[PDB]
Design a protein around this ligand. Structure first.
Ligand code: HEM
Ligand code: HEM
Ligand code: HEM
Ligand code: HEM
Ligand code: HEM
Lengths: 304, 306, 306, 305, 306, 306
């Protein structure tokens, strides 16, 4: 099976598009699905090799049942709301996801325009986010973001559905959350206090040693080990976004995994806490305003 | 006089911020204006040479009177509304303009944050546009945008105030209009009909012959000669922007000129028309939703403030 | 496993195409050259890496094969077959060797060409030399993006490289070449929308026409072939513009690689002889083939152990 | 006044077009001259900043009188043939020169196509050369080519007409010659011998010292000093060209100068020699097959036609 | 199933070679650093991707291996063997750990070397530190192109990575380093033609000399070796220039990877001790070895699992 | 109009600083080299244009000048003035010629340095050789951005080039060099906020500390100087990192250019001796000067005319 481009080269721009399907809009949706790879080539080819344009297309749980009969991927369910003692992970509507990435925003915008043009009258936009990475891979909190992502074989093992669900091999599961930051509060901390919240040094990006790293630091709470003592990993491509005039400074989280159970265990640790950690300290400066879960099929599924 | 970076090398991203100055906010703005060049260096230096970050700061006519006590640039006035039979050019509020450009959008955003941090509580935002150039210099209508801009000595002569206003030599005047387009109407026309709207061929950007170029084309109406028969010129750096979800597809227009009279004359011809042309046909697919005029002083003028 | 030649190459903006016949008694000099071509490619290109992106793919003709080697023949190796259609004809012309040379810069291509021809002087006669350049936005001489639908990755490998079906020649491929001359005057007299109907795609945006409007005699519809099982039969193209302004020669050099010549020959038959629903490919109304040959490009290790 | 792009940044591709004007062709040519700066911006603007497309247009002595009335540039005359004891600098026909330069040949070709599309039926082609520099600024003989070109204000002084001819300030004079090389004879020398021909080291491009540099080396003959002992300089943008099947290996010479007499003095020294040199030894491996002289007017001159 | 280290790196223009010995009692501090070195690679390099191309290959010497680890040793690991030739000698010099650090820029190499050596203060003693730089056209200090005949792709894998023959260390390699200093005065006293006869390729164009003119004592003749079956034996080199103008030190840092040190050893034996037809490699009359050490570079999983 | 040397260079990522003394009887050989160095720059640089940006600025010391030249001398040319503070000391060390060689890559620098030294062998003795490298974000070894408030354009020319105040030497400049080593262990035990109070700017964002919080003994405070007429007295710096990881040597090579050494001297006096409000520059609590030399860099034509 040929996968969609979940395993993309690094990109500096992105458009995230989340829509719901209107009643009656199912067949227009299906026709787009069968053409989305053709559109990707059409927009991207003339801008190569620097463009790096790709599109990953996801389908939510409730949408799947409307669109397709027969077998359902084994881990597809709606996003699970988490109501912690202090912080909460909200669940918000979404039926399709377009994750569009490139080296420049104009290529993302071009592709989005063609997709949205084909769907007009068949869907309702829920969220549109134009992301940009800082030139040194830093996020809105000023920390490098992406450093521990798996690469090569480890990435394929972590991200791609295999023989555990054969009919859907080559697919993946995407979780999105739009965060908005309290920048005023964050900038009132010392750099050393920010370090203790994330778990790594700010300027040099070196992990804090195990003797100094807090139990409630981000890196601590999202480090998860499986039965066999192996690291359970996800692949993230978080993107900064914002608006200077409305004081909107955000991180657009997106995490890919082979099963949602990994990502969901991480979110439970962050929002609900553990015996040794009340919650992820990053959430004292970060509020989630969306939350959705999708299955991103194999490319050959969409073609048929 | 050292100008601000009006004559920038080509850039693929911009932010345009327009703000009004609240009652009492004047001292806070003066302090910021004296620091703006220092912030552009702080944000941009460590990204050289590929970052190409620059900020041009512009001040409106009403703001000028509140901020500065002495002489006024000769050409500085409120943007003049134009009510034609069909199309209107609106005047909207704007005291200060920050026109931020770079090779990437994050550098523009960093500078925009530092500026707005210094101005919080003293200004109200009126407009914020994130722009992005297409990879072949095309605008939202599919046409190459910028080809006939002046270059080198010719552009310096068209854009920068000189002897005519010598206390303000080294400044320029900028006109800003945000235009939204009707893209479904546009794409219903045949390529050849689009070529009659603009005045140039779509794929190869070659100007149409004088034998075929309609009088109400955009290229006809915006070409002006002076008394002596020499061409009057402006420098533009129009930027696409928009939102696919809301079907907003736009051009942010910005023109710089040594005097407003040249840009005003062009606007007059587009909206009000001529003996042979009712109006610029590009306006049958473009609506103006903002309209403001700004003087962009010499860089030393800003440094020497309090 | 056999090592292919660089049939599957990264994009290149320049090429040279060299087609020669082997003179009587020149067999031995050609064999020696074959054994060193890969070493010449390295010697010219290695110091210009990684931006140079120099490669050469060598092919051999049906009659030449039997002159050079003894033992087995590749299964699909045969002379280019002439196509005499009611209107358009595909000519067969002589050619014993093909050098298909690619790089980011024409001077690298010329340097390698110089070395190869240096070694073959007096043993071969030139038939065709074309120096190709692609336009900055992947357009061809007709002003359409060209190469959009080529296969990539693993599908490219399955479509082009010989496998188990002919195990002695696994890792090889078949090249068909055709030099075409365009009537650019006729072409440039069509509207864009009518050009879109000849090719089967949008010109500016390169989006394929939908199935309810795509003509049966467009290029894309005729070169779209399904097999027995209903698999799309695919080829890999690297078409290159060429020409001379002074002699009015505006051309497309066609080259297509395929695991078996049958696929390329079925497309040619549909172009030239037509189907029940299409008399011929409308592209031929603006395009005339002046050369035509068929070559086998063996695995690189076959040429080495020569 | 605004000069044409004579002073170009380095480009790796070029197209040289030389044509003659047919009977009744003048009107069509004048209309194109008025348009060629607009055409350059039309082809080039959308491929900026990497494209570096420029067109310099040149007019020959005979053509000037057919196209324009009134003043002539003071230095404009037909190319002067030089019949040396061994080597000959030939004169051939040309009314108009288009010198087209870019980072890639497709851009050069697109411009050329539009210019010639406008001139079709008015003009006859004399020469068309597509040129390519090697990736390390080397020419067909294997040497670095362009090292001692002047730069900056020194180039401007050497190349652009000024006060001496104020009606034509901002323009320049271009001499073109196409050279074919005998590569097999060149590759027969050792490197040391080739260095003696040129006047510089082959790999490092360091000039041979005055005591070792032969009097008949290329660098020695083309190094001229004025009355006051100042150096007379030209700007060159030589380009390799060829065809492997016909065994054609070429340099296209093009030199610009504020007066033709500098370039002509250098040609004299090369083909006729001096007291201590019979001729330029580069000529023992290089044969001139065209020669023409052109004036390249200020760009405003053409725009105003 | 094993993941190798980055032995097969893309081309890099900067390097740092660090060789250290492990002090008495430093074993535990070393093992902890070995388990983190891949993490430190990401820490330094991630934020400069994708153009940074930062990597670190870590190797371990024979004596060191027994001090650090209990259980099996890699089959070919032993100390560098000194070669005492009639004229030329290849010395063995102490070395327990190699860090071969490559990137597109020297700052990334230096930052990573800083972090590694910071963790190892107190536990190791430096023996050598070289800062390598590319000449821009892949030349070495002798002015010849250096790298041309290196294997690529599949051939490279097979030549470099330990396989089924030593399954516990699959994904490993063996590295041989020698720092050479050149007599540049002597070399530049040669004609280019004489320099060509030393190396066995043309200087300017890098084309290999024909088999009937290439001397038997030429560098290329003596490092060309065939196996029992007749097949070539290959190694992967990434030789780097280094130097100090004031002290007249002009050098080549030789580094050569192979799946077994027998291949590299056979090349060295042929260079230093000669054959029946060649006394020694002529390159050594202008090149003196001042270090020599052998290391095993384990699979990446081996280190992390520590 | 006298042509300056390339004091005002574009940004470069690599440098070699070469400081020599002239041996007894070497004057003639140095005079000949000085007259050819601009030719050597062209020869080495040209074939790497346009990315190479290779330049060499040649400096002559006070004692050397008197040895090489007769007649008038630059008005400001003296040996470096040793500074003996209560705590910290600026040393003076020998140096007759400075070569400041810059480029986008180290190989160009090294090849030019090799041509220069080759011509001078026998005539001069080396005193210092430093190979610098920039960090990808313009940072120094203390972790701060380094060069931000350097003058640019017309301001830079006015600051660095000699003019009508010494017209026989118009187009020259003065260069002061000091090699600094940093105690990084001591620096790294400060908090980020504490490091920011030493320098005078924020570490991550490079924004100037406000006038209400900037310490009197911070770097930026002490090196900000105003003239009688209220004008800012500016120098042009191109400080470069260097080091050796094995030796734990981590350095900044300081070089500053100005039209009179009185400007550079005033800033050194404030650092090492202090003011009324500050004992010394706190940056010297982590930085030790180990060289100190002053040179005059004549106009280009001065050097050619020899
Ligand atoms: C709320 C906004 C978020 C921000 C700004 C943020 C930023 C960071 C940064 C700076 C790191 C360390 C560098 C790196 O390895 O990338 C990190 C690590 C990580 N975060 Fe986040 N992150 C956010 C949310 C999330 C969420 C919601 C999840 C998971 C569901 C997640 C999972 C991870 C994981 C697994 C790692 C790597 C831990 C390791 O070293 O193994 N993060 N993130
Ligand atoms: C409404 C959105 C606008 C769009 C999409 C737009 C687009 C264009 C395009 C495509 C061209 C041709 C290529 C070139 O740039 O030279 C152009 C030319 C021009 N436009 Fe606009 N334009 C707009 C508004 C205006 C306005 C409001 C003015 C003046 C106030 C203006 C002044 C000009 C000028 C002066 C020219 C060059 C004409 C020439 O001298 O050949 N534009 N415009
Ligand atoms: C006059 C010569 C030619 C020109 C200028 C030309 C141009 C084009 C263009 C513009 C496309 C559409 C974009 C693309 O997918 O690359 C196309 C597609 C194609 N052409 Fe041609 N072509 C020519 C000759 C040939 C010939 C001789 C063949 C085959 C024997 C060929 C086979 C194809 C195929 C198979 C495709 C892809 C169809 C699809 O699956 O979408 N073409 N070519
Ligand atoms: C015949 C084909 C020609 C070739 C292959 C050629 C090649 C070269 C080369 C390699 C150099 C040395 C590097 C440099 O550019 O500075 C050079 C220098 C020069 N060439 Fe040519 N040249 C040719 C014809 C001519 C002609 C016809 C002229 C003038 C009429 C000329 C004038 C010069 C000048 C003035 C220099 C610079 C000398 C100096 O001041 O050092 N060349 N040529
Ligand atoms: C003084 C140190 C060295 C210098 C400057 C040097 C330089 C060269 C050069 C210029 C080439 C020809 C182009 C190419 O890389 O293929 C060459 C080839 C080669 N060198 Fe070295 N080398 C050195 C040491 C070594 C040593 C110590 C060995 C082996 C232990 C070695 C093995 C090779 C091999 C195998 C080739 C490939 C030959 C072939 O198959 O064509 N070299 N080297």
């Amino acid at each position: 099976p040929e996968p969609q481009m979940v395993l993309s080269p690094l990109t500096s721009a992105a458009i995230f598009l989340v829509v719901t399907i209107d009643s009656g809009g199912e067949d227009t949706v299906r026709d787009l699905l069968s053409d989305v790879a053709s559109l990707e080539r059409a927009v991207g080819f003339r801008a190569q090799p620097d463009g790096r344009l790709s599109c990953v297309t996801g389908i939510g749980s409730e949408a799947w049942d409307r669109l397709f009969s027969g077998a359902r991927p084994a881990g597809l369910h709606p996003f699970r709301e988490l109501d912690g003692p202090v912080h909460r992970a909200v669940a918000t509507p979404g039926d399709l996801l377009f994750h569009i990435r490139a080296s420049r925003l104009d290529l993302c915008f071009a592709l989005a325009t063609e997709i949205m043009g084909r769907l007009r009258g068949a869907v309702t936009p829920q969220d549109e986010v134009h992301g940009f990475k800082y030139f040194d891979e830093r996020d809105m909190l000023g920390f490098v973001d992406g450093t521990e992502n798996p690469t090569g074989a480890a990435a394929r093992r972590a991200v791609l559905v295999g023989a555990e669900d054969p009919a859907f091999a080559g697919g993946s599961y995407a979780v999105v959350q739009k965060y908005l930051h309290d920048i005023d509060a964050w900038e009132g901390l010392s750099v050393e206090a920010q370090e203790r919240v994330i778990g790594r040094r700010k300027m040099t990006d070196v992990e804090l040693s195990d003797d100094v790293k807090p139990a409630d630091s981000h890196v601590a709470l999202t480090s998860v080990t499986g039965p066999d003592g192996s690291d359970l990993e996800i692949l993230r491509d978080n993107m900064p976004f914002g608006s200077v005039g409305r004081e909107e400074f955000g991180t657009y989280f997106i995490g890919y995994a082979r099963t949602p159970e990994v990502t969901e265990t991480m979110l439970e640790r962050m929002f609900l806490g553990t015996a040794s950690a009340p919650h992820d300290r990053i959430l004292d400066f970060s509020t989630a305003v969306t939350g959705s879960l999708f299955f991103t099929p194999a490319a050959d599924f969409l073609e048929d």
